[PDB]
Structure formats: C-alpha cells, structure tokens
Amino acid sequence: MNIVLMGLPGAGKGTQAERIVEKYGIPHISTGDMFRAAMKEETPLGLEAKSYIDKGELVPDEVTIGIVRERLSKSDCERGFLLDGFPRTVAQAEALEEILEEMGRPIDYVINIQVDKEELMERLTGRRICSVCGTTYHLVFNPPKTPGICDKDGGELYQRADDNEETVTKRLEVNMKQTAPLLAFYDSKEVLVNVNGQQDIQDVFADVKVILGGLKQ
Ligand SMILES: Nc1ncnc2c1ncn2[C@@H]1O[C@H](COP(=O)(O)OP(=O)(O)OP(=O)(O)OP(=O)(O)OP(=O)(O)OC[C@H]2O[C@@H](n3cnc4c(N)ncnc43)[C@H](O)[C@@H]2O)[C@@H](O)[C@H]1O
Ligand SMILES: [Mg+2]
Ligand SMILES: [Zn+2]
C-alpha cells in the first residue's frame, strides 16, 4: 500500500487522500502542506519555497526530494503511505524510485485523478479550507454544514493564498507541462492507473477503492 496521487490543481487529490487514509490506514504525505506549514513558521525552507509557491511555480526538485526522503524514513511509512502532489516532475519521480528501492518500498500504484482543465478554475475559486485540520470544502460542490466553519472541529475556513484566479492560471500551465512526461514515465513502469475525477466525490472514491482494494500483501 505504497501509493502516489497525481492530478492537475483542484482535481481532487486532497479530497480523495482524506478518504484513502480513513479506509486504508496509511499516512498522508502532502508536499503542498509541508511547504505551506514551513512558510507559516517562516523557516529558511519556508522562505525559500514561498517565492515559487506564490507565483504558482514548482519549488526546485532538490529541496522537495529532500523533505520527502526525510518524511519517508519515519517508522509510520513501514506499513505504506499516500504521497499527494509528489512527484510532480520526472526528476522527482526518478529520485523517488531510487529512494524507494533503497528502502524496499516500491510504489504499487500512481493514481492520476483526471479532470478537464476547464473545470478546475471553478473548483479552486470556490474552495474554502479549514485553518485547523486542512480539510477542503467547496461553496457549491461540497459545502460545510455552517458557512465559514469546519464540520469536524469548528475551525475558521479560509482561502488558500494561491487560489486567486491569476495564480490558478499559472499553476495550471506549470503543471500541465509536467503531465505528459510524468504519465509516460509511470505508464512505462506499469504502475499508472487513471481515474475519472469529474464525478461526484463518492463516485471518484468508489473507483479508487476498486484499484486499492485489489492490492494484497
Ligand atoms: N512535488 C512538488 N514539487 C515542487 N513544488 C511543489 C510540490 N508539491 C507542491 N509544490 C508547491 O506547492 C504548491 C501547492 O501544491 P499542492 O498543495 O499539492 O496543490 P495542487 O497540486 O495544485 O492541488 P490542490 O491542493 O490545489 O488541489 P486538490 O487536487 O488537492 O483539490 P481538493 O481535493 O482540495 O479539491 C479542490 C476543490 O474542489 C472540490 N472538489 C473535490 N473533489 C470534487 C469533485 N469530485 N467534484 C466537485 N468538487 C470537488 C473541493 O471541495 C475543493 O473545493 C504548488 O503549486 C507548488 O508551488
Ligand atoms: Mg491538495
Ligand atoms: Zn477542520
């Protein structure tokens, strides 16, 4: 149960990751969350990633590989893991292959959550996120029970700094450029599985369960 999620901005990685963690009991590793936390604490890593994140650009490969290697060396990952948003370039995928061969934990599947770019701006412009637990809502497609508050913990919802329309536009263009190379890389490895992410959330998850419930230790 060593899984990677890939998708264009707003395609649903975090929403599906939360459901995967709850059903299969593996830890969630999100590079976006790691960088935004370091930004928040203003660590040197934080301050250095911020210039890229704010513009909607990729943080450089070397630093991102490093935080992922460190995270994967923790003991929770022995049973599996769900990488979310990493790799997102070919060079990050090649490093991860090498790390995971050294660790003895090769990827079982890379799940690509496919959504038309033309749907993604509306997903991100309506996204409202819990300041406490990070879960995401959408004003129309997945609202909280009470506006402005998270259902789980009563935390204040906020708008991610990079979800402004002109940032979303750059994020889409930056990540669309990596898409073909990365799908070729993992299809040629025979670990890529695509899912149609333009369905109701529970229907996307049903397809994820066909894939992950088919794995056996
Ligand atoms: N490896 C790496 N290398 C270098 N730089 C890196 C890096 N990783 C990260 N970075 C940097 O960090 C930045 C942020 O990375 P990251 O945090 O990974 O952002 P991302 O990849 O753009 O993905 P998002 O979190 O925006 O979208 P999501 O697909 O998780 O959508 P969600 O489930 O929330 O859902 C979106 C919205 O839609 C709603 N929704 C979800 N599913 C559905 C559905 N099926 N139908 C309708 N609405 C839906 C939700 O409620 C929500 O409102 C990057 O831009 C880069 O600068
Ligand atoms: Mg996310
Ligand atoms: Zn919350």
Side-chain angles (χ1 to χ4, degrees):
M1 186 77 52
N2 304 327
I3 309 300
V4 173
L5 305 183
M6 60 181 288
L8 287 176
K13 287 193 297 268
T15 297
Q16 294 302 313
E18 284 193 353
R19 290 161 177 71
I20 289 165
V21 173
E22 177 185 44
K23 172 74 165 172
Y24 297 105
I26 52 181
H28 185 196
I29 305 174
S30 165
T31 37
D33 283 336
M34 290 158 96
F35 284 138
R36 283 186 299 272
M39 282 170 60
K40 184 167 161 93
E41 290 168 60
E42 310 179 296
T43 59
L45 156 81
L47 266 312
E48 284 137 20
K50 175 183 165 63
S51 89
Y52 303 85
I53 292 174
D54 284 354
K55 270 192 300 183
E57 277 160 26
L58 296 192
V59 174
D61 295 328
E62 176 262 323
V63 60
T64 303
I65 289 158
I67 66 179
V68 176
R69 183 209 58 70
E70 183 176 70
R71 176 77 182 83
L72 289 166
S73 77
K74 295 305 157 145
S75 44
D76 58 356
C77 294
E78 173 138 62
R79 73 181 171 264
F81 55 72
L82 181 66
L83 279 164
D84 167 356
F86 178 98
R88 82 194 304 145
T89 63
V90 174
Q92 285 175 21
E94 284 168 331
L96 180 63
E97 289 297 277
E98 292 174 354
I99 292 161
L100 297 180
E101 180 188 329
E102 282 164 350
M103 293 182 171
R105 298 176 176 177
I107 291 167
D108 289 302
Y109 294 119
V110 178
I111 297 177
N112 175 49
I113 301 173
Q114 192 155 332
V115 179
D116 287 339
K117 61 212 164 163
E118 294 83 7
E119 316 291 289
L120 302 176
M121 182 71 65
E122 174 172 1
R123 288 204 187 169
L124 294 173
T125 65
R127 172 164 62 174
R128 297 303 179 262
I129 313 188
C130 182
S131 60
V132 176
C133 72
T135 201
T136 70
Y137 296 93
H138 187 281
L139 289 179
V140 181
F141 304 147
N142 188 15
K145 304 195 198 148
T146 298
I149 289 314
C150 178
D151 290 357
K152 288 162 39 188
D153 54 47
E156 192 175 4
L157 303 182
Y158 74 101
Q159 292 172 62
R160 235 174 71 185
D162 61 347
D163 274 351
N164 300 302
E165 103 168 325
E166 76 269 14
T167 313
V168 171
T169 294
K170 183 59 178 191
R171 292 159 55 193
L172 293 167
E173 167 195 309
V174 164
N175 292 277
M176 284 168 55
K177 205 171 182 215
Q178 294 295 329
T179 298
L182 273 179
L183 292 176
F185 175 93
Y186 279 127
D187 196 29
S188 75
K189 301 282 187 190
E190 296 193 303
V191 295
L192 177 73
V193 187
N194 296 306
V195 298
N196 180 4
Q198 189 153 339
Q199 312 183 69
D200 286 352
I201 288 166
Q202 68 191 139
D203 295 329
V204 181
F205 185 63
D207 287 359
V208 170
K209 284 190 299 173
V210 168
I211 299 160
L212 302 187
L215 295 171
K216 294 186 190 152
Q217 337 276 343

